[PDB]
Scaffold this motif. Structure first.
Motif, mmCIF file in Angstrom:
data_model
loop_
_atom_site.group_PDB
_atom_site.id
_atom_site.type_symbol
_atom_site.label_atom_id
_atom_site.label_comp_id
_atom_site.label_asym_id
_atom_site.label_seq_id
_atom_site.Cartn_x
_atom_site.Cartn_y
_atom_site.Cartn_z
ATOM 1 N N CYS A 1 0.773 -1.261 0.000
ATOM 2 C CA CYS A 1 0.000 0.000 0.000
ATOM 3 C C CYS A 1 0.805 1.313 0.000
ATOM 4 O O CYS A 1 2.009 1.323 0.283
ATOM 5 N N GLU A 2 0.111 2.408 -0.330
ATOM 6 C CA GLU A 2 0.641 3.780 -0.273
ATOM 7 C C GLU A 2 1.339 4.098 1.046
ATOM 8 O O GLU A 2 2.432 4.675 1.054
ATOM 9 N N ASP A 3 0.692 3.719 2.148
ATOM 10 C CA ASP A 3 1.095 4.144 3.491
ATOM 11 C C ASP A 3 2.317 3.407 4.052
ATOM 12 O O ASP A 3 2.855 3.790 5.100
ATOM 13 N N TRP A 4 2.751 2.364 3.348
ATOM 14 C CA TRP A 4 3.909 1.569 3.751
ATOM 15 C C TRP A 4 5.078 1.789 2.813
ATOM 16 O O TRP A 4 4.955 1.634 1.589
ATOM 17 N N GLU A 5 6.212 2.145 3.405
ATOM 18 C CA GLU A 5 7.418 2.498 2.668
ATOM 19 C C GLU A 5 8.636 1.886 3.378
ATOM 20 O O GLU A 5 8.680 1.805 4.600
ATOM 21 N N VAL A 6 9.613 1.445 2.601
ATOM 22 C CA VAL A 6 10.799 0.794 3.150
ATOM 23 C C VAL A 6 12.026 1.687 3.042
ATOM 24 O O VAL A 6 12.199 2.390 2.048
ATOM 25 N N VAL A 7 12.857 1.673 4.078
ATOM 26 C CA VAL A 7 14.147 2.357 4.037
ATOM 27 C C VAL A 7 15.268 1.335 3.910
ATOM 28 O O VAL A 7 15.690 0.755 4.917
ATOM 29 N N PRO A 8 15.765 1.119 2.674
ATOM 30 C CA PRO A 8 16.769 0.078 2.434
ATOM 31 C C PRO A 8 18.073 0.339 3.189
ATOM 32 O O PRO A 8 18.360 1.469 3.586
ATOM 33 N N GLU A 9 18.837 -0.724 3.383
ATOM 34 C CA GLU A 9 20.047 -0.699 4.183
ATOM 35 C C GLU A 9 21.228 -0.322 3.309
ATOM 36 O O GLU A 9 21.381 -0.874 2.223
ATOM 37 N N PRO A 10 22.075 0.610 3.771
ATOM 38 C CA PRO A 10 23.290 0.998 3.055
ATOM 39 C C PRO A 10 24.110 -0.183 2.525
ATOM 40 O O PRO A 10 24.379 -0.250 1.327
ATOM 41 N N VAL A 11 24.489 -1.103 3.408
ATOM 42 C CA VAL A 11 25.318 -2.249 3.027
ATOM 43 C C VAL A 11 24.578 -3.184 2.059
ATOM 44 O O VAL A 11 25.204 -3.870 1.248
ATOM 45 N N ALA A 12 23.250 -3.187 2.138
ATOM 46 C CA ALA A 12 22.413 -3.904 1.176
ATOM 47 C C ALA A 12 22.613 -3.323 -0.224
ATOM 48 O O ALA A 12 22.807 -4.060 -1.189
ATOM 49 N N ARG A 13 22.581 -1.999 -0.322
ATOM 50 C CA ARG A 13 22.770 -1.318 -1.595
ATOM 51 C C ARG A 13 24.174 -1.543 -2.157
ATOM 52 O O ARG A 13 24.318 -1.890 -3.338
ATOM 53 N N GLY B 1 30.591 3.531 -1.058
ATOM 54 C CA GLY B 1 30.403 2.091 -0.808
ATOM 55 C C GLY B 1 31.555 1.204 -1.267
ATOM 56 O O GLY B 1 31.482 -0.016 -1.165
ATOM 57 N N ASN B 2 32.610 1.852 -1.770
ATOM 58 C CA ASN B 2 33.922 1.276 -2.094
ATOM 59 C C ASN B 2 34.620 0.663 -0.878
ATOM 60 O O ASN B 2 35.564 -0.113 -1.027
ATOM 61 N N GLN C 1 34.549 -3.277 -0.930
ATOM 62 C CA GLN C 1 35.601 -3.987 -1.660
ATOM 63 C C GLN C 1 36.861 -4.137 -0.808
ATOM 64 O O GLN C 1 37.513 -5.188 -0.819
ATOM 65 N N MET C 2 37.182 -3.084 -0.059
ATOM 66 C CA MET C 2 38.324 -3.084 0.859
ATOM 67 C C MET C 2 38.126 -4.054 2.031
ATOM 68 O O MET C 2 39.074 -4.742 2.438
ATOM 69 N N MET C 3 36.895 -4.113 2.550
ATOM 70 C CA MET C 3 36.519 -5.089 3.587
ATOM 71 C C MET C 3 36.690 -6.538 3.122
ATOM 72 O O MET C 3 36.999 -7.425 3.924
ATOM 73 N N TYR C 4 36.470 -6.762 1.825
ATOM 74 C CA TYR C 4 36.617 -8.084 1.215
ATOM 75 C C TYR C 4 38.065 -8.541 1.174
ATOM 76 O O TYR C 4 38.350 -9.732 1.276
ATOM 77 N N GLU C 5 38.970 -7.580 1.021
ATOM 78 C CA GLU C 5 40.400 -7.851 0.979
ATOM 79 C C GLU C 5 41.031 -7.939 2.375
ATOM 80 O O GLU C 5 41.763 -8.882 2.660
ATOM 81 N N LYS C 6 40.746 -6.964 3.241
ATOM 82 C CA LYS C 6 41.420 -6.865 4.543
ATOM 83 C C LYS C 6 40.494 -6.290 5.636
ATOM 84 O O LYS C 6 40.545 -5.098 5.914
ATOM 85 N N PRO C 7 39.647 -7.141 6.262
ATOM 86 C CA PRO C 7 38.689 -6.685 7.270
ATOM 87 C C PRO C 7 39.320 -6.078 8.520
ATOM 88 O O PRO C 7 38.723 -5.182 9.112
ATOM 89 N N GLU C 8 40.495 -6.571 8.922
ATOM 90 C CA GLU C 8 41.190 -6.057 10.108
ATOM 91 C C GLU C 8 41.589 -4.597 9.891
ATOM 92 O O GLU C 8 41.697 -3.826 10.848
ATOM 93 N N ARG C 9 41.810 -4.237 8.629
ATOM 94 C CA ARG C 9 42.202 -2.885 8.252
ATOM 95 C C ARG C 9 41.010 -1.929 8.146
ATOM 96 O O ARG C 9 41.107 -0.748 8.532
ATOM 97 N N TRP C 10 39.889 -2.446 7.643
ATOM 98 C CA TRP C 10 38.790 -1.594 7.214
ATOM 99 C C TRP C 10 37.520 -1.614 8.064
ATOM 100 O O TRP C 10 36.626 -0.801 7.827
ATOM 101 N N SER C 11 37.451 -2.501 9.057
ATOM 102 C CA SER C 11 36.230 -2.659 9.858
ATOM 103 C C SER C 11 35.687 -1.368 10.451
ATOM 104 O O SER C 11 34.489 -1.094 10.326
ATOM 105 N N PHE C 12 36.555 -0.598 11.114
ATOM 106 C CA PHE C 12 36.150 0.644 11.776
ATOM 107 C C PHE C 12 35.619 1.657 10.771
ATOM 108 O O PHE C 12 34.625 2.319 11.028
ATOM 109 N N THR C 13 36.298 1.774 9.631
ATOM 110 C CA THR C 13 35.900 2.694 8.568
ATOM 111 C C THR C 13 34.562 2.246 7.972
ATOM 112 O O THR C 13 33.673 3.064 7.719
ATOM 113 N N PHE C 14 34.435 0.934 7.771
ATOM 114 C CA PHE C 14 33.256 0.331 7.163
ATOM 115 C C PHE C 14 32.017 0.536 8.023
ATOM 116 O O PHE C 14 31.007 1.013 7.530
#
Ligand SMILES: O=C(CN1CCN(c2cc(-c3cc4ccccc4s3)ncn2)CC1)N1CCCC1
Ligand SMILES: O=C(CN1CCN(c2cc(-c3cc4ccccc4s3)ncn2)CC1)N1CCCC1
Length: 225
Positions: A26-38, A44-45, A48-61
């Motif tokens: 319905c009209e009255d129902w709307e979804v707010v999609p998730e950043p990481v989903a998108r 959102g680059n 890709q960095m998280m895929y290579e080195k999570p220990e490096r990028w977790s905080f930034t991500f």
């Protein structure tokens, strides 16, 4: 007043599918999609960095994810939807799962150190003391699936970078969701979440045979808030 509902669940539990069913009604129902989903396939680059080195990028991500979440959710509160009299906003996950499921897990896996983890929390607390009132949840929908259901749905969805996800990881995120949303034994910094009503949906079966009962249960639940 727009009712805010977050949809919570483990990886590939069926959030997107569920949102796809919900956003159709319905009209009255709307979804707010998730950043990481998108992101999942410029900023959102970080993904890709998280895929290579999570220990490096977790905080930034996690920092970027949550800020993206906060703005999109704030943004969305400002329709052109603020009417009429039963408008509902569905959030794909929340600021809480960002922190208590995901960021939290990344620290326990040593992808963030003590300092990264303290800063993140310090930052998270502040943000929500500045906008908590606006983004406060009226309800949570928990999509409950087994770790194995989720592992299999990861496989089916086909993201090549997700194919190395071990079951033990899914088991951990599972415990945390159960602990927060079923048992309510996970304590957070947001005491209003101790009252927040919670609809738990078993999404282990194929959505295609179930989505009707599911929507039936959601409406039932929405009317009780
Ligand atoms: O000490 C580590 C570091 N590590 C902990 C377990 N891992 C992870 C990864 C992730 C993620 C990788 C990733 C990639 C994109 C977006 C979100 C995420 S979350 N989350 C928890 N533990 C892999 C790396 N290792 C143990 C297993 C492989 C190396
Ligand atoms: O990061 C996520 C969600 N998410 C975590 C699972 N993802 C992953 C995880 C992993 C891994 C987890 C893990 C655990 C142990 C060893 C290797 C690995 S690899 N790899 C790719 N994408 C991407 C989406 N979010 C951030 C805020 C809310 C959702």
């Amino acid at each position: 007043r727009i009712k805010k509902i977050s949809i919570e669940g483990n990886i590939a539990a069926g959030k997107s599918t569920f949102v796809n069913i919900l956003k159709q009604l319905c009209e009255d129902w709307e979804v707010v999609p998730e950043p990481v989903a998108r992101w999942c396939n410029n900023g959102g680059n970080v993904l890709q960095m998280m895929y290579e080195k999570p220990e490096r990028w977790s905080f930034t991500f996690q920092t970027y994810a949550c800020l993206s979440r906060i703005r999109a959710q704030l943004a969305s509160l400002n329709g052109k939807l603020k009417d009429a009299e039963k408008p509902v906003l569905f959030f794909e996950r929340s600021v809480y799962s960002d922190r208590y499921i995901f960021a939290s897990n990344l620290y326990e896996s040593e992808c963030m150190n003590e300092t990264e983890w303290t800063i993140y929390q310090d930052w998270h607390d502040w943000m929500n003391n500045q906008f908590g009132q606006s983004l406060e949840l009226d309800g949570i929908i928990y999509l409950q699936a087994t770790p194995e259901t989720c592992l299999h749905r990861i496989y089916l969805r086909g993201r090549n970078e997700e194919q190395g996800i071990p079951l033990e990881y899914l088991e951990k995120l599972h415990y945390k969701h159960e602990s927060w949303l079923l048992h309510r034994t996970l304590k957070t910094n947001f005491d209003y979440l101790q009252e927040v009503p919670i609809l738990t949906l078993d999404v282990n079966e194929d959505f295609k045979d179930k989505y009707e009962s599911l929507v039936e249960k959601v409406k039932e639940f929405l009317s009780t808030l």
